[PDB]
């Protein structure tokens, strides 16, 4: 399905399997939250994220 949907243009269609335990998320990799600790706002925070 993921390979077949790779032919769809202007749409990021991709398929995946549910996690082993749905109560949690993917539970693989890492989750990192970049935070604005000095009120830099949205515009400067996006620059930091990029």
């Amino acid at each position: 399905a993921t390979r077949a949907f790779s032919q769809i243009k202007d749409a990021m269609v991709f398929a995946f399997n549910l996690p082993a335990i749905v109560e949690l998320g993917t539970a693989t990799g890492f989750d990192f939250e970049l935070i604005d600790q000095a009120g830099l706002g949205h515009e400067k925070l996006t620059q930091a994220r990029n």
Partner: protein, 50 residues
């Protein structure tokens, strides 16, 4: 109440954080008993009454 007590109007955004907005008479004009004499409230006919 607004002049001598301070009225919380509504919030405002301060460096990305929501903070209150207050209206309250300047400190010079609400200190003595006689200062009440210079406060005027508009009447329905447009005149200013003390």
């Amino acid at each position: 109440g607004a002049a001598w007590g301070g009225s919380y109007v509504n919030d405002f955004i301060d460096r990305g954080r929501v903070k209150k907005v207050y209206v309250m008479s300047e400190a010079k004009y609400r200190m003595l008993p006689d200062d009440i004499g210079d406060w005027y409230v508009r009447a329905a006919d447009g005149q200013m009454v003390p």
